Design an enzyme around this catalytic site. Structure first.
Site, PDB file in Angstrom:
ATOM      1  N   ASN A 185      38.892  40.096  37.868  1.00  0.00           N
ATOM      2  CA  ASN A 185      39.720  39.575  37.020  1.00  0.00           C
ATOM      3  C   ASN A 185      40.587  39.019  37.381  1.00  0.00           C
ATOM      4  O   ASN A 185      42.044  38.536  36.851  1.00  0.00           O
ATOM      5  CB  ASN A 185      41.031  41.281  36.316  1.00  0.00           C
ATOM      6  CG  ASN A 185      39.892  41.864  36.246  1.00  0.00           C
ATOM      7  OD1 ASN A 185      40.208  43.009  36.800  1.00  0.00           O
ATOM      8  ND2 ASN A 185      39.538  41.421  35.508  1.00  0.00           N
ATOM      9  N   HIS A 187      43.342  38.499  40.309  1.00  0.00           N
ATOM     10  CA  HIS A 187      43.466  38.584  40.550  1.00  0.00           C
ATOM     11  C   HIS A 187      43.216  38.944  42.436  1.00  0.00           C
ATOM     12  O   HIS A 187      42.246  39.280  42.845  1.00  0.00           O
ATOM     13  CB  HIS A 187      44.128  40.482  40.382  1.00  0.00           C
ATOM     14  CG  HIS A 187      44.355  39.797  39.280  1.00  0.00           C
ATOM     15  ND1 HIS A 187      45.944  38.921  38.742  1.00  0.00           N
ATOM     16  CD2 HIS A 187      44.536  40.447  37.876  1.00  0.00           C
ATOM     17  CE1 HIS A 187      45.649  38.957  37.172  1.00  0.00           C
ATOM     18  NE2 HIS A 187      45.316  40.264  36.952  1.00  0.00           N
ATOM     19  N   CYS A 222      50.549  38.439  44.876  1.00  0.00           N
ATOM     20  CA  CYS A 222      49.952  37.183  45.426  1.00  0.00           C
ATOM     21  C   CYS A 222      49.563  35.981  44.296  1.00  0.00           C
ATOM     22  O   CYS A 222      48.631  36.815  44.375  1.00  0.00           O
ATOM     23  CB  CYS A 222      49.825  37.095  46.948  1.00  0.00           C
ATOM     24  SG  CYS A 222      49.754  35.684  47.590  1.00  0.00           S
TER      25      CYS A 222
END
Ligand SMILES: C[C@@H]1CCCCN1C(=O)c1cnccn1
Ligand SMILES: C[C@@H]1CCCCN1C(=O)c1cnccn1
EC number: 3.1.2.14
Lengths: 264, 263
Positions: A185, A187, A222
């Site tokens: 995804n 991330h 982050c």
């Protein structure tokens, strides 16, 4: 891998691969965390899933708030580790996932882990208490009586972690995520933060000690284009450290934690 | 995993784990390379090793000089990939290791790889050429008639890679190895360089294309405290010329080419 007889937990055996062993000639803390994630994903898949159809509808996701791992013995290349995982509801606060790691040959407990998960809106990043409808959807896959990997009345998995004060004793500056640190995804993988925290541990400790305990609090995600500073200060035969991950620019906190190391 | 009936090659099946799948929803180029390394290590272990006791005495090691991988279909999370690997002597020049990747369900070839290994003194870093003593000890584990993953007479795996000229079209600077990028012997693992080369490919290409071919030449090892710049220029399906160099003096560590196909 398979669900156990009662269908309330999942077990899987994993071989430790060559690319999963570090400088210590055994699996790293990051390899252990990767194996915990894999067994957790296989457990959710075995029961038709992280998100129920009600969560997907409202753009809600489960996010890690805390991760606590304790390792007594690290497996070597080619060793088989048996991991048992289960989930439990924690009222409206969130969910908990626990793990027990065992040596496949001896049957002895070589490690254990626990994690706190909270509900969050995917888009706004706003946390929320667990609704009754969502609670009942996952309760059928969880043990009803409490089942804790860390049962002890005053154990180390529930200690509040303080914020590191400047100046830090040790630091590793300008840490950037690579495209490999991103999941399906896009991330940054929660395992990456474990690596970044360990980047500021002094080389002498790394060469002569093994990590026994790690408690990591997640405060902020982050992004792919963010730069992070890793900060460490000794708080202590055994060495203890207080850790802080913050954005390289504004110093916005992304994580805080503690590590306990034992002499090899 | 196991050696085949003739004991001249090794086969193993691997499940693709959740932490091994990338943005593409499938295994990454780095995951494939990790699986090639694992099957290579298990093959050397299954025959008692890939340093012989003679190389150990003289402080000699096998080092990768070239790696060439071609992927036709990337496995998804939970898919089982069957990999067959074997070695072959290439006279005094060095050794070659080849791989064939297959889909466990269909039996079709989903990828193939080849690598050139050279002999080196681990202390001085000097190339030494393969002795006769070290040959009769590893030839008993290699097929005698040539067996090539890339048989085609003058194909993609044997093309000389030119050096990228400044200014580079794309770049990713200040790349540092983390403690996780080091192997059991504290060296930066060869898979890390594949990641660093791909760091300078534009985001547009990464999101809409899949890597089909990668040829990587290894020139110098990167130390734990070294900083690297990743350089890329389009030479065209999209083709790129790549260069990894030290951030300071610009000393070359790797050069390569990638070929990408539209999803
Ligand atoms: C020293 C290694 C190398 C990578 C950075 C930190 N490490 C670990 O994660 C580890 C591995 N085994 C025992 C304790 N710690
Ligand atoms: C785009 C991904 C994300 C990580 C960096 C490069 N990638 C690959 O290794 C890859 C390439 N082609 C197909 C599948 N995966």
């Amino acid at each position: 891998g398979s669900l156990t007889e009662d269908g309330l937990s999942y077990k899987e055996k994993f071989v430790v691969r060559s690319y999963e062993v570090g400088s210590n000639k055994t699996a790293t803390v990051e390899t252990i965390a990767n194996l915990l994630q894999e067994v957790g994903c296989n457990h959710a898949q075995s029961v038709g899933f992280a998100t129920t159809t009600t969560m997907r509808k409202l753009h809600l996701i489960w996010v890690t708030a805390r991760m606590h791992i304790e390792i007594y013995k690290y497996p070597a290349w080619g060793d088989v580790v048996e991991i048992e995982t289960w989930c439990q509801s924690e009222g409206r606060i969130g969910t908990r996932r626990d793990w027990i790691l065992k040596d496949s040959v001896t049957g002895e407990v070589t490690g254990r882990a626990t994690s706190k998960w909270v509900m969050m809106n995917q888009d706004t990043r706003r946390l929320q208490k667990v609704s009754d409808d969502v609670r009942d959807e996952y309760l059928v896959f969880c043990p009803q009586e409490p089942r804790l990997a860390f049962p002890e009345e005053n154990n180390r998995s529930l200690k509040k972690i303080p914020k590191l004060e400047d100046p830090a004793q040790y630091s590793m500056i300008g840490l950037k995520p690579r495209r490999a640190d991103l999941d399906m995804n896009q991330h940054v993988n929660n395992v990456t933060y474990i690596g970044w925290v360990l980047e500021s541990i002094p080389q002498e400790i790394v060469d002569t000690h093994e990590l026994q305990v790690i408690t990591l609090d997640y405060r902020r995600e982050c992004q792919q284009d963010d730069v992070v500073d890793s900060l460490t200060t000794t708080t202590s035969n055994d060495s203890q450290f207080l850790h802080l991950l913050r954005l390289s620019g504004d110093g916005q906190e992304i994580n805080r934690g503690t590590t306990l190391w034992r002499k090899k």
